Symmetry: C2
């Protein structure tokens, strides 16, 4: 019998608890590095005069080590102003990590938010937590002897990949076409072209050329980087319907929810947006407002893997496709865990920071057997480091 | 430089993929056992004539072993009719697990749903997946060398616990009071009394006697098991506001969303419900309808840990508290991972199925250092097994 007329309580033998035997964070190192871009980069934001060409990328790295011998690495970044502040805040809150069980990621994330309650739950402050949150996930996956995608649970072992770095607006059409050949010969699965410049006719000229060279079937997409007004957006949308694009990205201001939704409802061509958003809450508003067919979160920008998972789940509930922005080294794993077929964005920019390179084969990027994020920091990453700080003591 | 005027693609050194190196399921064992209750149990569902007293609990167990030596165990259950069907379906779909990478839990879940697409995505069929899903989570945690709560990430090392076993309607008042003493003496943190019998006067009587014995501060809660109509629910609710109860559980039919929502908005006392729901979708309708202050999902009943997690995330997003039903062996880990302070329900019924027992101290149940669920099947569980089947070959 499993019960009686009264109530009985069992006596435990193994009096040992999870609290007293869990691992502990003992050391943390933060770094602010700058990735130089020899060829200044310009998208529509530059051509409209909203910004200056991009000449470097700030990279904020977090390295964490536990008492029991585990280590995690993660990073966030900034294109243009923002890296100094991300590093500075991370440095001001990092010591809160010491003595914490590294497996209680959300508990730690919350503690970090309270430690910096004055500066919000979105924006730069969460981007300062991103490197740490990502490093903790990297550590847990390694602890389990699994690539991050497998710790989370994968739906696919490789992801469709398209290139963005060879289609910027500072690049002459003849060179853009040369890049398409190089990219395709290397097994790329799609091409994205930057548009949204004042001269609309030119963008059409460039787009028609690319589609012409690629052929009717090869996946092709465009990105306006918020540079069109509503009138121009719909107009260009109608005109582009003919190219059979996988999507039209950021046709309007990143916070113009009704404008995006209106555009997505009027065109059969999918609408994509989200890279500029900096929190789950911001993405939620776009999603509830039916802003786009493709949701494009950026783990470093939204606060790390933890909030990115919540964003993915919400998008999935709304039947939206996922096309994460930049940081393929991290997004490869997240997109592999997405229920619906996703897209991965390629830039060769961060390659020098790591000793390993991802495998691009037949249009898809494959998940290697390496653990966690599957990357180790290179000598160059250290050479490009401008500021660093440490807490605790190396075990 | 990290870029150039054209586009460049690196070359991967390592060529092994997560696909080719991942672990593989090679053996599965399902069991149908019956846990006897020498003392017939009856709540308001029996006193109103809806059901017959409970005399046993069906337990469907799943054991999975991987090629690389990992092992996982999980289970689901049925109180009254339902166990023969859960086991029968689990037996008819289990073979699909062979050759699958055990880490891709959602991927496997989806395959199991397609294998039984004819029988739905809610109800008995997902309860047949439950043992398997739970075993896979048990395995993944063990693979990381962590208790499940730690794999998920915990917000607490122990959970407030209340007893239900000693507050049933077939128990005379004096015996209920004796159980309160026994329970409180064993370190219980709360007491729940079953109410909802035809005689509303006898329920108030018992409730007043229990509050009197416990004192004004001890956590006290009640459960009507859906036996009141809206008229009675509000009247009893007004009358019970004086007892300062932690919550009023299942005052109405489990699917009466507006009815619950109406009671929750009208009363200051929290309203709780959800134990009878059998899927994320069902819980979602109640949550979107603002049905209760406390959400009470049951992992075995909703399809396992995977759907229970999505339910938790939704409830948390809506600012609700969590109080899982039954199966403390599994819910201890899930509630530990909940962001808001939850409650754990205690029954001794399942104690004999496992070799290990949980530690109850100072009103809370503690998470042990044991990995995964932290339980191993006892010899008694084998003695109580009536049916069993196996697939594959033990590694």
């Amino acid at each position: 019998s499993a019960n009686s007329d009264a109530v009985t309580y069992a006596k435990a033998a193994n009096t040992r608890t999870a609290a007293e035997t869990g691992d502990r964070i003992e050391w943390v190192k933060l770094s602010l590095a700058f990735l130089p871009l020899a060829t200044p980069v310009s998208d529509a934001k530059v051509l409209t005069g909203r910004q200056k060409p991009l000449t470097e990328v700030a990279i904020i790295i977090a390295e964490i080590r536990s008492r029991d011998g585990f280590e995690g690495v993660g990073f966030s970044y900034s294109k243009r102003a923002g890296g100094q502040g991300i590093y500075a805040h991370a440095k001001e809150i990092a010591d809160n990590l010491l003595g914490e069980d590294p497996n209680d990621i959300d508990k730690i994330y919350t503690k970090l938010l309270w430690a910096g309650a004055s500066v919000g739950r979105s924006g730069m402050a969460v981007q300062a937590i991103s490197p740490i949150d990502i490093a903790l996930w990297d550590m847990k996956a390694k602890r389990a002897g699994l690539p991050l995608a497998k710790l989370l649970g994968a739906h696919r072992d490789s992801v469709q990949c398209y290139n963005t770095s060879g289609g910027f607006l500072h690049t002459p059409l003849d060179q853009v076409l040369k890049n398409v050949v190089i990219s395709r010969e290397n097994g790329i699965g799609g091409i994205k072209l930057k548009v949204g410049q004042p001269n609309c006719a030119e963008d059409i000229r460039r787009l028609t050329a690319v589609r012409e060279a690629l052929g009717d079937e090869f996946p092709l997409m465009v990105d306006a980087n918020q540079q069109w007004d509503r009138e121009t957006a719909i107009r260009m949308g109608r005109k582009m319907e003919q190219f059979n694009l996988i999507w039209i990205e950021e046709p309007l201001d990143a916070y113009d929810i009704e404008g995006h939704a209106q555009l997505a409802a009027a065109l059969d061509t999918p609408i994509a947006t989200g890279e500029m958003l900096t929190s789950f809450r911001e993405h939620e508003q776009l999603i509830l407002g039916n802003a786009s067919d493709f949701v494009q979160p950026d783990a470093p920008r939204v606060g790390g893997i933890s909030p990115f998972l919540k964003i993915m789940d919400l998008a999935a509930k709304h039947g939206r496709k996922l096309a994460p922005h930049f940081a393929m080294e991290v997004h490869l794993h997240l997109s592999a865990a997405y229920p619906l077929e996703p897209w991965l964005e390629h830039f060769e920019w961060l390659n020098p920071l790591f000793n390993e390179q991802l495998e691009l084969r037949d249009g898809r990027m494959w998940i290697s057997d390496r653990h966690g994020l599957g990357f180790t920091l290179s000598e160059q990453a250290r050479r490009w480091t401008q500021l660093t700080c440490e807490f605790g003591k190396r075990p």
